[PDB]
Design a protein around this ligand. Structure first.
Ligand SMILES: [Ca+2]
Ligand SMILES: [Ca+2]
Length: 71
């Protein structure tokens, strides 16, 4: 009916360290199944470290818009 998430791995909430498991598998190659659709936002794939941060940064609670920023 309604949900808020952007770039989820296991469609839990978002792609972060928590989804590092599927990440390691994804980083190595494309074998698993993840919502890579809107998982990448810097042509990386998911969260190599640049997004990971912004993720744990916005996913902290702001999870709704995600103030995508560099750092
Ligand atoms: Ca998740
Ligand atoms: Ca990314």
């Amino acid at each position: 009916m309604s949900t808020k998430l952007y770039g989820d791995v296991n469609d839990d909430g978002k792609v972060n360290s928590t989804d590092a498991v599927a990440l390691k598998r994804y980083v190595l190659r494309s074998g698993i199944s993840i919502n890579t659709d809107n998982a990448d936002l810097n042509e990386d794939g998911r969260v190599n470290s640049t997004d990971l941060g912004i993720l744990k940064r916005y996913i902290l609670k702001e999870i709704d818009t995600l103030p995508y920023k560099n750092g």
